[PDB]
């Protein structure tokens, strides 16, 4: 453990905190909280604060439900932006039923359940290293986002340079000051697109860090008069934003994906994991790509994956295996976008990997032939299938997969399906300006 209770009281005592946010994550991934004064810290640490647990369901909530707000001590963070009379601190909390049973509708509790299932298979840790990409848009006089990018930079370019600006540098330094472990940063392919990579950590810690990273990036960009968005594809004809996930499975404290005496230096467990991810890839796409805009990124020609295949070196593979081996042996899933809920995406990815491991599925041959050259029919006879083209197709695929349903439980399944079906129905009935530009004068 990193913090104990007495440390928490002492820290708030010297730091003079007056406002505490007990933050949690709903189905859609947006950060929610209930706020208490510092005088209620004792009640909060006693797992006694109640709130409406239906707020997790989002806009599809029906009835009020009372749940507890068990906080996590290790997630205690003091926000650097002082709020006038006193500072603000945050806790990331789990959701519990009034009888003490953890709430089955909490994505974080679902991820913990999947991790418990993984521990039941003999493994100890499941590490995640994320590569979240985001865009920076300039604000106007009224303080709302515009469509102008902050710089005309390029891949790994030294575009922002010195002499002020460099919002990425300020974000990285500020995150370092808050206890984050930033690995490296660079300018992304598209103009105004940036990437910051964290050090790999535990799954729950990685998801918490992803949520905090989104919050901090948005706040700091707002400070610099900029808009930061994790939209998968804000602009057409320009590279999209991905959240490539580097997954590594550990057994008895050592990497279980590494085997020095096998081909590609990969263990049989790694091959089973890859097979499991390949088998369910079309099924969990609805969870890893939960928005309508997510499937405008999944188009050819922008390094985003479009077919189910794994490789060590290829143009936009679904699964990529980095050259580094040993302790750092990992499998990278590149279909995930930053708009996905980290807990749900990690849950479905881990469930697919464990399904591959449990049934000892055989991984297909790696692809190193530039499948983009061959036609869709010219590659369908192989083991290469296409990812769902729309959110509705991905929802249809996700409903049919039995394993992926248990990956997040019946409550999350029904509420996620209802919310996404409403979202798709709203989009499909709209009349977009493109249609008027194409048909109003022609017809």
């Amino acid at each position: 453990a990193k913090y104990t209770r007495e440390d928490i009281e002492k820290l708030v005592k010297e730091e003079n905190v007056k406002y505490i946010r007990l933050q949690f994550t709903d189905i859609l991934g947006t950060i929610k909280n209930v706020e208490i004064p510092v005088s209620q810290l004792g009640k909060a640490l006693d797992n006694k604060v109640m709130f409406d647990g239906s707020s997790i369901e989002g806009f599809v909530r029906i009835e009020e439900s009372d749940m507890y707000l068990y906080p996590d001590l290790n997630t205690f963070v003091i926000f650097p932006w002082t709020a006038e009379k006193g500072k603000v601190a945050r806790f990331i909390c789990d959701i519990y039923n009034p009888d003490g049973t953890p709430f089955e509708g909490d994505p974080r509790n679902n991820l913990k359940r999947i991790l418990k299932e993984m521990e039941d298979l003999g493994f100890s840790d499941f590490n995640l290293g994320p590569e979240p990409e985001f865009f920076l848009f300039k604000l106007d006089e009224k303080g709302e986002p515009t469509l102008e990018l902050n710089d005309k930079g390029g891949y790994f370019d030294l575009a922002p340079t010195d002499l002020g600006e460099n919002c990425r540098r300020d974000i990285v330094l500020e995150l370092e000051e808050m206890g984050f472990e930033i690995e490296a940063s660079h300018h992304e392919v598209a103009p105004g697109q940036h990437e910051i990579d964290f050090k790999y950590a535990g799954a729950v810690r990685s998801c918490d860090d992803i949520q905090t990273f989104k919050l901090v990036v948005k706040t700091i960009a707002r400070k610099h008069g900029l808009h930061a968005t994790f939209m998968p594809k804000p602009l057409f004809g320009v590279n999209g934003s991905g959240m490539h996930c580097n997954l590594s499975l550990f057994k008895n404290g050592v990497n279980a994906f590494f085997d020095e005496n096998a081909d590609l230096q990969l263990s049989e467990t790694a091959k089973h994991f890859i097979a499991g991810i390949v088998k369910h890839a079309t099924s969990f796409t609805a969870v890893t790509n939960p928005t309508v805009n997510s499937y405008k990124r999944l188009v050819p020609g922008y390094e985003a994956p479009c077919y189910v295949a794994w490789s060590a070196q290829n143009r936009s593979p679904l699964i990529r295996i980095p050259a580094s081996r040993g302790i750092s042996t990992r499998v990278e899933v590149r279909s995930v976008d930053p708009a996905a809920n980290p807990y749900l995406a990690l849950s479905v990815l881990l469930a697919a990997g464990l399904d591959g491991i449990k049934n000892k599925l055989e991984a297909p041959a790696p692809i190193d032939r530039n499948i983009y050259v061959m036609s869709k029919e010219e590659r369908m006879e192989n083991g290469i299938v296409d990812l769902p083209a729309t959110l509705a197709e991905a929802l249809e695929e996700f409903k049919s997969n039995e394993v992926m349903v248990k990956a997040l439980g019946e409550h999350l399944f029904e509420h996620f399906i209802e919310a996404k079906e409403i979202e798709w129905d709203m989009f499909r009935t709209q009349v977009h300006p493109w249609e008027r530009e194409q048909y109003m004068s022609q017809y």
Binding site: V189, N239, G301
Partner: peptide
């Protein structure tokens, strides 16, 4: 096609 994000600079 097959390369649009990289060659978008032109």
């Amino acid at each position: 096609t097959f390369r649009q994000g990289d060659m978008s600079r032109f």
